[PDB]
Each structure stands twice: as C-alpha cells, then as structure tokens.
Amino acid sequence: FTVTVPKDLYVVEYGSNMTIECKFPVEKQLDLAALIVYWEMEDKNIIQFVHGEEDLKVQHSSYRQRARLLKDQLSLGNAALQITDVKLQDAGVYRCMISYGGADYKRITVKVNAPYNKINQRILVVDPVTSEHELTCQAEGYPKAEVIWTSSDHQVLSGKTTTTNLFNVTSTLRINTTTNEIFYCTFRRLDPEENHTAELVIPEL
Amino acid sequence: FANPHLGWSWXXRXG
Numbered sequence: 360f361t362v363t364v365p366k367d368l369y370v371v372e373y374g375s376n377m378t379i380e381c382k383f384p385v386e387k388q389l390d391l392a393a394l395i396v397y398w399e400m401e402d403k404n405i406i407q408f409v410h411g412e413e414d415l416k417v418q419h420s421s422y423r424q425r426a427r428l429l430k431d432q433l434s435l436g437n438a439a440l441q442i443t444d445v446k447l448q449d450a451g452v453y454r455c456m457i458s459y460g461g462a463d464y465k466r467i468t469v470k471v472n473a474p475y476n477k478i479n480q481r482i483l484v485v486d487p488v489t490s491e492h493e494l495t496c497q498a499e500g501y502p503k504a505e506v507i508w509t510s511s512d513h514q515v516l517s518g519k520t521t522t523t524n525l526f527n528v529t530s531t532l533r534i535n536t537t538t539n540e541i542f543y544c545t546f547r548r549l550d551p552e553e554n555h556t557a558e559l560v561i562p563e564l
Numbered sequence: 565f566a567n568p569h570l571g572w573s574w575x576x577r578x579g
Binding site for chain 1: 566570572576579
C-alpha cells in the first residue's frame with residue numbers, strides 16, 4: 360500500500376482555487392467502511408475523514424468554509440483536497456495520510472504568490488478652478504511594495520504612500536493638471552524586482 | 565485518533 364502524489368509542489372496565486380491530489384489504490388468499488396483520510400498542515404487539522412463521516416467542528420478555524428475533500432474523487436482513489444480563495448497562510452507543507460488496508464502518507468509543498476496586479480485607481484477633481492487633481496492608486500499584495508509616480512515623460516513625481524495591514528498599499532498624488540494628461544502609478548516589490556503599473560488619464564472636468 | 569469528532573495530531577494521535 361502506497362500513497363502517491365502527481366505533484367508535490369504547487370505554486371498558486373492569491374485568491375485563486377486549488378485542488379491538491381493524493382492518490383491511493385482502489386480496486387473497482389471503494390470500501391468506505393475501511394477508509395480513513397487525514398489532511399494536515401503544520402499542526403492544523405484540515406480533513407479528518409472516518410468511514411464517510413466528517414465533523415466540521417474539528418477543522419482549523421483558518422480553513423473553515425474554504426477546505427473540502429472531494430468525495431467524487433475519493434471513489435476513484437484520489438483524496439483530493441480543494442481549497443477555495445487561497446490565502447497567504449495556506450502556504451506550507453501539507454500532509455495527506457490514507458488508511459485503507461494499510462497506511463501511508465505524502466508531503467506536498469504549497470507556495471502562494473500575492474502580486475500587486477489588481478490596482479484600483481481613482482481620479483478626483485478636488486479644485487476645478489485651480490485644476491488641482493487628486494490621483495490615487497491602491498492594491499493589496501505581499502511583500503511590501505513601494506509606489507512610484509511618474510509623468511508621461513517618465514519623470515518621477517512625489518506622492519504620499521500609506522501602508523497598513525497581506526499588505527494594503529495606497530498612494531495619492533496631488534497635482535495641478537489638465538484633461539488627457541497621462542500619469543503612471545507603479546507598485547514595485549524587490550528581491551526579485553517585480554513591477555505592476557496602472558495608467559491614469561486625466562478625464563474631462 | 566480515529567474519532568472524527570475529536571482533534572487529531574501528527575501522526576495517528578490525539579490533538
């Protein structure tokens with residue numbers, strides 16, 4: 360009796376859905392009365408499956424309403440763990456243990472990437488007479504990102520960035536400008552360098 | 565272990 364994993368490394372994007380496969384030999388008809396399934400992640404209990412019975416109250420709080428064992432896959436020898444809306448705390452080493460006329464287990468490493476690729480922008484006309492505009496870009500991600508404001512000719516402009524807690528980074532640029540002028544807000548993380556940029560076009564008043 | 569209503573711990577133990 361051996362449990363096998365087709366992949367022991369998963370790299371997943373924040374907020375996505377993930378199914379970790381965990382295979383074990385089943386001959387034709389699954390004997391539910393002899394099957395135990397245990398999904399664990401670094402002292403956190405995810406799935407405690409006994410002869411078809413699960414009790415959601417023993418599932419760790421951080422996984423509640425997000426982690427489930429696919430019963431359809433179980434019948435075919437695949438103790439597949441599905442995690443929806445993946446978070447940063449889902450990164451780690453998962454252990455899937457199967458008891459089914461013998462017992463075995465395998466480790467699966469999960470990495471979660473949270474890039475700043477969803478930039479929310481807004482442009483406010485705070486004073487039409489003086490043509491003063493307030494440009495704001497906000498994004499969530501990990502790790503910490505700096506925000507660089509540039510003009511259309513790529514000259515760096517001075518804005519105000521506020522970082523609070525996954526990081527929530529917002530930055531605001533107050534500038535006197537006119538319709539159709541173009542500005543860029545760039546969210547930059549390092550080690551290694553990764554950039555995500557939104558283009559902001561000054562609209563009609 | 566292996567009561568589905570009780571917490572478990574690695575490996576095949578009480579949690």
